A paper describes a structure:
In addition, Syx1 and Syb2 both contain a linker region (LR) connecting their SNARE motifs to their membrane anchors.
To corroborate this interaction, we synthesized a Syb2 peptide (residues 75–93 of Syb2, containing residues R86/K87 and W89/W90, referred to as the LR). The C-terminal segment (residues 87–92) of LR was resolved in the complex structure. This difficulty might arise because the high ionic strength applied in crystallization impairs the potential charge interactions. Nevertheless, the backbone of K87 is observed to be positioned near a highly negatively charged patch on subdomain D, which is adjacent to the hydrophobic pocket bound to W89/W90, indicating that both R86 and K87 are very likely to bind at this negatively charged patch under physiological conditions. Unlike the α-helical conformation of the Syb2 LR when bound to SN25 and Syx1, as observed in the crystal structure of the cis-SNARE complex, LR assumes a folded but not α-helical conformation when bound to the MUN domain, raising the question of whether the MUN domain maintains this interaction after SNARE complex formation. The observation that the MUN domain prefers to bind a non-α-helical state of the Syb2 LR indicates that the MUN domain might dissociate from the Syb2 LR upon the full zippering of the SNARE complex into the membranes.
Author numbering:
A (entry chain A): 944 to 1038, 1049 to 1480
B (entry chain P): 13 to 18
The structure:
Amino acid sequence: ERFVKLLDQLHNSLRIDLSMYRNNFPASSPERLQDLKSTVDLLTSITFFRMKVQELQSPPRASQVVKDCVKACLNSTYEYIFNNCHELYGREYQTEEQGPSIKNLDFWSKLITLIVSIIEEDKNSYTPCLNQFPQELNVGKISAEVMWSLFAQDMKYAMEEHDKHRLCKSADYMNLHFKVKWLYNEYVAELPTFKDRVPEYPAWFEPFVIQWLDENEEVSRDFLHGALERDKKDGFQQTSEHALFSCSVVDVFSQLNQSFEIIKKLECPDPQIVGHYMRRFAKTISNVLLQYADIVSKDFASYCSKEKEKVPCILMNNTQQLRVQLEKMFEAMGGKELDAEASGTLKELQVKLNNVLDELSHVFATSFQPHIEECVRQMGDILSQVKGTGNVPASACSSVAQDADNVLQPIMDLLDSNLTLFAKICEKTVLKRVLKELWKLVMNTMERTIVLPPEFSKLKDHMVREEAKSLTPKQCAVVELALDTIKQYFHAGGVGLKKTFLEKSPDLQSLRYALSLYTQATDLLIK
Amino acid sequence: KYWWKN
């Protein structure tokens, strides 16, 4: 009975020894590492003896006792490097009120480095040293778990404190978040305890990233007012041959993507948090791009109207390019899988940008409005001089076809050099928008110049509309043909508006109805 | 000529 207590004494004595294995058996000494191995051997033998002979329900066996001693050493080890962080770091690494500070994060970066040295030491030394129970005792594995867990407890508390006072640059919080992710993924993420993930660490830094985003938006919005002036001062030059937009466009999206790339490198493993960053950054993209549009749409006229006309086209191309490179970001932020409220704001942004390209195109087309009205009054005058010339030599006769050409000649001289210039320097959509707009403008002006309805006059008592003065048969025919020709002129054999669009154009239908009042001479009953 | 050929 005095033997069983003599054994317990010995078992306990070795427990004390191993509970400080690192300090008692330095990795520097190979022979001391051997002694450590001998010490574990002796412990198991004592345990094996007790389990075979005695039947005290078996206290460990061995592996669980050593494990608990190793966990102890780690708790002590963590305490050591926490209290001696500064000295340990500056002595081995490098390039007062020590311990955690609230004015700087330096202490935590140095602590991480020391933590790694410990884990690495337990992997490279000790683990091969203590190889008695490979299935059940991996010192390096258990070193990483304990060291991370002890570090996580302090880091969580530190960031809650930093949340209240802020005081450090957003950069410094951002980098620490990055360095922690590296530590977690390198040593912890593939551990049984943690494998199920949803790790807690990103939540510690969440308010610091949001702040960085808040600062980032105000930085981007600042970079905007600058990319545009640099472009405007350079005179919105087309970049290169097949890129119909200017430099301010590539500058903005490089800035937006660099910023997004920062969030991406965080590799946030908490989707709920990832949705938060995406929801916030989407607001940044919106406010930046909308500002680009709002900046341009507030200056568009001054470049347009009076020649030249290249710049207004490019400004529209730019605005279109915003639309295409947004969608490219939408996929980069993982479209469809993207947070709903985030994709919602971006899809509401594609609409706003679209409804700006339209507004812009309308302003541009209207810059031709006066000259068009002049060309249309000119073509109404020519039409009014259309006569039948029967009893007259066959060479002096002007045909319906020749007459229609003469009617359209003013407006064609106007548009020719233009349409031609566009299409050459507009994206398809930009060109189509301008043509659709110029189309509506020509049809409307024609409806309100050559074919204004008869006026009202007081008839007997109650103001009736007068009878329309019918065009002559030759006049009707010249109108019809000229009209049909403009349509083909805007179709342009498959570069202009589609024939389906022109036909169902409500502006063409109104002009045809207006025309119908005057064209009674040739209109068929029974069509 | 047609403005869309050149």
